[PDB]
Amino acid sequence: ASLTEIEHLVQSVCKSYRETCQLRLEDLLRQRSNIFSREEVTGYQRKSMWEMWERCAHHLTEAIQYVVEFAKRLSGFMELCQNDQIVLLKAGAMEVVLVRMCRAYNADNRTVFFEGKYGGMELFRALGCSELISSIFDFSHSLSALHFSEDEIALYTALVLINAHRPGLQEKRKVEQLQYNLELAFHHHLCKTHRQSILAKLPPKGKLRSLCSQHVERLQIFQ
């Protein structure tokens, strides 16, 4: 493919993302002032770990649906065999949610948008996972500090889903070509937007997997 075809791929991936971004960026930034009261935090803190794991897993399932809808809106992904479409979505859907999460994160007060309002990491106190909640706040802080754009999330998550390294793939070569083109599309877009600077400042690829595997470990016990 040509440089015009790489540009078209960027546009397409960014179009698919915007159509499935779940919550509008403009809405999320406006709601940054809409913070939960002390009695509202207390209300969540009083809830059972099972009630909180039920709510979090409900929102996670909901978020994963938009991720599946994002991958379904990618031409190359649809061309893959069903087993490969499943293998990539099972291994990457939750990792994509953890990346998408930075839009709902506010670095000015260390709060995240959860159930209509912004709340601190003390909102999730009931789970008994202070280490795990800190880990997802720190990860969203590492991306929000960089001011990770909508298009940047779009291309990064496309690379998270399309990874030929995943075990269980039959058409590894086909996925490799899709990964290579998206890698080329990501770097080309960073040049066009003068964001080459953020590449070295991004999470060390393997960290997202370390964070996700530790979370599925805690989740599998309750779901």
Stretch that binds ligand L8A, among 68-76, 124-132, 141-149, 172-180 (CB under 6 A): 124-132
CB 60 within 8 A of CB 141: no
Here's the x/- map for ligand L8A, 77-116, by CB under 6 A: it reads as: --------------------x--xx-xx-------xxx--
* Nearer CB in complex with ligand L8A: 77/118: 118
53 vs 186, beta carbon nearer ligand L8A: 53
Q: What's the chain look like in SS3?
A: CCHHHHHHHHHHHHHHHHHCCCCCHHHHHHHHHCECCHHHHHHHHHCCHHHHHHHHHHHHHHHHHHHHHHHHCCHHHHHCCHHHHHHHHHHHHHHHHHHHHHHCEECCCCEEEECCEEECHHHHHHHCCHHHHHHHHHHHHHHHCCCCCHHHHHHHHHHHHCCCCCCCCCCHHHHHHHHHHHHHHHHHHHHHCCCHHHCCCCCCCCHHHHHHHHHHHHHHCCC
CB 74 within 8 A of CB 158: yes
Name the residue nearer to ligand L8A (CB basis): 23 or 164.
23
125 is an interface residue for ligand L8A by CB under 6 A: no
Q: Does 56 bind ligand L8A (CB under 6 A)?
A: yes
Asked if 59 touches ligand L8A (CB under 6 A), the answer is: yes
What minimum distance in Å lies between the beta carbon of 40 and ligand L8A? 16
Q: Is 117 in the site for ligand L8A (CB under 6 A)?
A: no
We find the least distance from the C-beta atom of residue 15 to ligand L8A, in angstroms, to be 16
Asked if 219 interacts with ligand L8A (CB under 6 A), we say yes
The encoded tokens of residue 33 equal 């002032």
Of 23, 41, 126, 146, the one binding ligand L8A by CB under 6 A? 23
Tell me: does residue 63 bind ligand L8A (CB under 6 A).
yes
Residues 55, 60: Cα–Cα separation, whole Å: 9
Query: Would you say 22 or 177 has its CB closer to ligand L8A?
Result: 22
For residue 178, the Cα-to-chain-centroid distance in whole angstroms is 19
Nearest distance from residue 131's CB to ligand L8A, in Å? Answer: 10
Residue ranges that bind ligand L8A, judged by CB under 6 A: 21-23, 28, 56-57, 59-60, 63, 97, 100-101, 103-104, 112-114, 124, 129, 132-133, 136-137, 215, 218-219
